[PDB]
Amino acid sequence: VEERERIEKQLLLEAERINEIDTLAKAHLSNHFNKEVLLAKGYTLKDIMQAQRRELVRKFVPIEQIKAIAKVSDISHIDGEILEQLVSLAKVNIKLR
Amino acid sequence: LSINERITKELAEVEERERIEKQLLLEAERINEIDTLAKAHLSNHFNKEVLLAKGYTLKDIMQAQRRELVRKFVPIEQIKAIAKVSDISHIDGEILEQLVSLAKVNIKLRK
Amino acid sequence: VEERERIEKQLLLEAERINEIDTLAKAHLSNHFNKEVLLAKGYTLKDIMQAQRRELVRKFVPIEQIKAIAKVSDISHIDGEILEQLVSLAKVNIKLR
Amino acid sequence: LSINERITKELAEVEERERIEKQLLLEAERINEIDTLAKAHLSNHFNKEVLLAKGYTLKDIMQAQRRELVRKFVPIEQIKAIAKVSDISHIDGEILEQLVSLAKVNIKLRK
Amino acid sequence: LSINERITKELAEVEERERIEKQLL
């Protein structure tokens, strides 16, 4: 049953990550990307989270890093570990901001 | 081996050599970029001539120049975030390529 | 996989040789023999390099050495180790020049 | 052995002797050139007579004269480049022929 | 001994002599 215990551990980890992302996004980007209205428009939870992450990168991370570190200007299809690096850089940017 | 098997082998052989030629051009551009960066942003003591006199491979010279440029331009926090560690002594590779891209962005915005 | 590693070593060696030859040639012979225009005219990379080497010999190395050391006046067909000796002598000549 | 086999053997035998005769003429011209060079550019102590008195083969005399001419005329850098080494003590041969050709070029341009 | 180990030793050697010179002054 400890397998489900560790699954629940990871569930809590990603839920806390989602909560942090949402809280920091609400005070930074807009109310138009709130979870309720995004769900009403018909987006899944993971899609909502990744869209919010990409918008976060499109606010703090400058474009030049995107076309150099992420190798593409459009964050529309870069998702993955590169997106993790981008959101880490965005966190650094908002820290220094 | 019919005619189609001849054509496909010929085309694959030609494409392989074309890709190799493109790789050679890419390596030449990499060497030129390393030369320009070392001349413009790093001290004379890191010139290829004196480093080669000390008995270092070309690739070692390239990665040393890259590691020095990252420390000079990229802040320590960005290194600790992207590379996940402070030390760049064992980060040569694709992560080093991302770091030098960030250093190029830093020098572009600095000017 | 180390066989490909040494192949890449030799690739870097010849790429550095090509880069050095090109850089020294551009400032010495002409812009007409630039890699871009030579490629546009339809010459392979090795053909471009050997043509640049022969032109280099035709600039620094005097003709008498060519018909004595290389045994022929025309560098058009001498390519090989003799061409290596000729380009070495050209390097010596540009050093003393 | 038919008639054609007779003709081809006869022609090959004749050509072999002609090539040998040409080789003998080439050796005579080589000896004449060595004599002229030793007389014109090298000291009397390297004359064939005194060297032979010291118990040296003819070929040794030729290569010694050549080695001395290369040092006298050809600069040390050209020797280190073409012959890949500074010492000419173990470079007798085709490389020595190239070196003496360069020495002939040097003496021609000197005048 | 890599390149970094050369640079750090060189800089430390230079700084030591500079401190000695300051001590002499």
3-state secondary structure string across A25-56: HHCCCCCCCCHHHHHHCCCCHHHHHHHHHHHH
Q: Which amino acid is at B63?
A: Q
Distance from C-alpha of D46 to C-alpha of D51, rounded to nearest angstrom:
6
Please count the residues of chain B. 111
D106 CB within 8 Å of a chain C CB:
no
H, E, C per residue of A52-76: HHHHHHCCCCCHHHHHHCCCCCCHH
- By Cβ distance, the residue of D77, D81, D105 closest to C64 is D105
Number of Cβ within a 10 Å radius of residue A53:
19
Contact flag E3-B89 (C-beta cutoff 8 Å): no
Residue E11's identity, in one-letter code, is L
C89 neighbors D82 (Cβ within 8 angstroms) = yes
Q: What's the burial of C6, exposed, middle or buried (CB within 10 Å: 0-12/13-18/19+)?
A: exposed
φ, ψ of residue A30 in degrees (nearest 5) = 180, 165
| Size of chain C in residues | 97
Question: For tokens 């060497």, what's the residue?
Answer: B31
Q: Is C45 on the interface with B (CB under 8 A)?
A: yes
Buried b (16+ CB within 10 A) or exposed e, B16-38: eeeeeeeebeebbeebeebbebb
Q: In Å, how far is C61's CA from the nearest CA of chain D?
A: 12
Q: What is the resolution of this structure in A?
A: 6.4
The two three-digit tokens of residue D11, written as one number = 């022609």
Instruction: Characterize A6-34 residue by residue with b for buried, 16 or more Cβ atoms within 10 angstroms of its Cβ, and e for exposed.
Output: eeeeeeeeeeeebeebeeebeeeeeeebb
A34 vs A55: CA distance, rounded Å = 12
In angstroms, what separates the C-alpha of C91 from chain D's closest C-alpha? 10
* Separation CA D16–CA D10 (nearest Å): 10
The Cβ-side half-sphere exposure at A63, using a 13 Å CA radius, reads 2
Q: State whether C65 and D105 contact (CB < 8 Å).
A: yes
C-alpha D48/C-alpha C86 separation (Å) is 34
How many whole angstroms separate alpha carbon B90 and alpha carbon B8?
A: 43
Task: Please provide the DSSP assignment of chain C as one string.
Answer: -HHHHHHHHHHHHHHHHHHHHHHHHHTTT-STT-HHHHHHTT--HHHHHHHHHHHHHTTSS-HHHHHHTSS-S-GGG--SHHHHHHHHHHHHHHHH-
| Measured distance CA(D99)–CA(D67) in Å, rounded | 9
Nearest-by-Cβ selection for B102 from A65, A88, A91: A65
Q: Of C42, C52, C57, whose CA–CA distance to C87 is shortest?
A: C57
Query: What number of CA atoms fall less than 13 Å from residue D104's CA on the CB side?
Result: 17
* Under 8 Å between Cβ of E8 and B71: no
**What is the amino acid identity at position C9?**
K
In angstroms, the CA B13 to CA B6 distance is 11
Q: How far apart are CA B14 and CA B9, in angstroms?
A: 9
* Rounded Cα–Cα distance for residues B89 and B103 (Å): 17
Q: Kindly list the residues from chain C whose CB atom is less than 8 angstroms away from the CB atom of residue D101.
A: 65, 68-69
D47: left (phi over 0), alpha (psi -120 to 50) or beta: beta
Query: How far away is chain C from the Cα of B2, in angstroms, using its nearest Cα?
Result: 30
Cβ <8 Å between C85 and D98: yes
Distance, in Å, from the CA atom of D11 to the CA atom of A44, rounded to the nearest integer, reads 95
Query: How far is residue B109 CA from its own chain's centroid?
Result: 21
Please name which of C89, D23, D53, D71 lies closest in space to residue D63, comparing C-alpha atoms. D71
Greatest C-alpha distance within chain A: 48
- Could you tell me which chains touch chain A, where touching means 3 or more CB pairs under 8 A? B
Beta-carbon contacts of C49 under 8 Å, excluding residues fewer than 6 positions away, are: C18, C21
* Token code pair at residue B83: 């590379």
Specify the 3-state DSSP secondary structure of B33. Answer: helix
Tokens of D108: 């021609």
Q: Count Cβ–Cβ pairs < 8 Å, chain A vs chain B.
A: 29
Smallest CA-to-CA distance from B83 within B91, B75, B93 is with B91
> Measured between alpha carbons, how far is B43 from E3 in angstroms, rounded to an integer?
13
All chains having 3 or more CB pairs closer than 8 angstroms to chain C: B, D
Distance of CA A40 to the CA centre of its chain: 19
Which is nearest to D64 in space by CA: D81, D47, D77, D78? D47
Q: How many whole angstroms separate alpha carbon D6 and alpha carbon C69?
A: 42
| Residue A20, H or E segment | helix A2-26
Q: CB of D109 within 8 Å of any CB in chain C?
A: yes
Distance between CA atoms of B50 and B38, rounded to whole angstroms?
A: 13
Rounded Cα distance, B71 and B90, in Å: 14
Distance from A31 to chain B by nearest Cα, in Å?
29
Please provide the size of chain E in residues: 25
Neighbours of chain D (3+ CB pairs under 8 A): C
Chain B residues with CB inside 8 Å of E6's CB?
54
Nearest to D48 by CA among D35, D32, D37, D36: D35
Inter-CA distances, B83 with A73, B98, C53, Å: 21, 9, 43
Rounded alpha-carbon distances, angstroms, from residue C39 to B29, C29, C56, D61, D96: 16, 17, 19, 53, 40
Cβ contacts of B47 on chain E, cutoff 8 Å = none
What is the CB neighbour count within 10 angstroms for residue C24? Answer: 15
Q: State the Cα–Cα distance between residues B78 and A88, nearest whole angstrom.
A: 9
Of C62, C64, C85, the CB nearest to D82: C85
Cα distances (Å, whole numbers) of residue D12 to C70, C92, D15, D18? 31, 47, 5, 10
Contact across the interface for B102 and A62, Cβ inside 8 Å = no
Residues B68, C60: Cα–Cα separation, whole Å: 38
Interface membership of A62 toward B (CB under 8 Å) = yes
Query: What size, in residues, is chain A?
Result: 97
